[PDB]
Amino acid sequence: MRNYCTKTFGSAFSVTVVPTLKDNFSYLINDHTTHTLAAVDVNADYKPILTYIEEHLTYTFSTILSTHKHWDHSGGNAKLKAELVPVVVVGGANDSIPAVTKPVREGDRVQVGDLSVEVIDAPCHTRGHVLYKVQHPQHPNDGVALFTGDTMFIAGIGAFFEGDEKDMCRAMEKVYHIHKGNDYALDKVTFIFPGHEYTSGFMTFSEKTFPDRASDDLAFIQAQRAKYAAAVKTGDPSVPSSLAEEKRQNLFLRVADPAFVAKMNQGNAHALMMYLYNA
Ligand SMILES: [Zn+2]
Ligand SMILES: [Zn+2]
């Protein structure tokens, strides 16, 4: 009973949230200016992507991007590529991603049609995990899609399978400061597309752990939590949240704000990250 939904960025591009496996999200990027399609985090259960393109939609389907190596994110790369181009498979250089033809590292960009895809290194959950920051260079104010895989979820973070709290702090610092160059004007139009529907458990955590009961961020967390749960209730994805929203509701991301670190009073940022991870 899990539905797709589609997030649109002005007239420039769209991102379709495709529920896969039990709780995974794969994504379809659609560049409207050139009719070019790309998939993110294709696993064994890739047919829902085709059914969407199929039912809902002259198209070039040119790229697959993998946030990290884990099978529930890359297990469909080869099988999806086989049909039938050429299909470029993008993945972080240090994750040895199945079927990769474009290994990438921090600062690299690839084009999907006229869209730019910028790569951010985020080792922790895997040694080679990356994030993909997608936008239209000629339409920067229409917003940004950020694909976070298993590094960041709504109100949450992934397990540190191949790394540690220092690695996650660095990842949170990068995400937090993406838009420093524009005085965070684009935070409100930057949308977060994570690996899984884990929003429920993490929002319950944010609501319980938020330290300042006098702030309206508590009321905000509460309203957001209910909002996401009602979506999940109708089959709708909880995702995406905006980066502006995450900066309020995601306590792990807020480790990148020194005032929040001081308010939590659980040691320095590294200590606090470990405190939150262990709670
Ligand atoms: Zn993973
Ligand atoms: Zn995963």
TrEMBL record:
InterPro entries: Clx_II_MBL (IPR035680), HAGH_C (IPR032282), Metallo-B-lactamas (IPR001279), RibonucZ/Hydroxyglut_hydro (IPR036866). Keywords: Hydrolase, Metal-binding, Zinc. It comes from the Eukaryota. Zn(2+) 1 binds at H68, H70, H125, D150. Coiled coil: none annotated. Residues 23-196 form the Metallo-beta-lactamase domain. One of its GO terms (molecular function) is hydroxyacylglutathione hydrolase activity. Its EC number is 3.1.2.6. Its cofactor is Zn(2+). SUPFAM superfamilies: Metallo-hydrolase/oxidoreductase. The keyword Acyltransferase does not apply. It holds the Pfam family HAGH_C. Zn(2+) 2 binds at D72, H73, D150, H196. Belongs to the metallo-beta-lactamase superfamily. Glyoxalase II family. PANTHER family: BETA LACTAMASE DOMAIN, HYDROLASE, PUTATIVE-RELATED. This is Putative glyoxalase II.
